[PDB]
Amino acid sequence: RLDPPEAEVQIDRLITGRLQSLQTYVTQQLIRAAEIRASANLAATKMSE
Amino acid sequence: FVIRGDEVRQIAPGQTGKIADYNYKLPDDFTGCVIAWNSNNLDSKVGG
Numbered sequence: 526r527l528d529p530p531e532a533e534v535q536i537d538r539l540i541t542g543r544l545q546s547l548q549t550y551v552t553q554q555l556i557r558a559a560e561i562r563a564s565a566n567l568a569a570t571k572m573s574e
Numbered sequence: 575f576v577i578r579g580d581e582v583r584q585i586a587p588g589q590t591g592k593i594a595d596y597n598y599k600l601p602d603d604f605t606g607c608v609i610a611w612n613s614n615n616l617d618s619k620v621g622g
Contacts, residue, residue: 530588530602 576617582610 527535577585577593584591587604594600 528590 576613579612 526532581591581593583589584593585598585600585608587600588602
């Protein structure tokens with residue numbers, strides 16, 4: 526729909542959006558990973574004790 | 575080279591134009607300067 530010299534601008538905006546979403550998703554993810562891992566250690570101790 | 579003054583703007587990087595389309599095109603990321611001036615007196619013969 527657009528010639529090269531302006532198409533990257535539209536592409537560039539999309540890159541920012543999708544990349545930002547990944548950070549939000551990934552950043553959100555490992556926080557839960559820490560929580561569950563913290564929960565896992567609690568479970569492991571309960572199993573042991 | 576010599577070109578009609580109207581197509582002077584065509585040579586702009588990333589800008590289309592008959593000259594740009596198939597004659598000669600700068601890269602979109604050209605670095606440098608475009609220097610031109612009227613050559614009517616020097617390059618306009620009464621006979622063409």
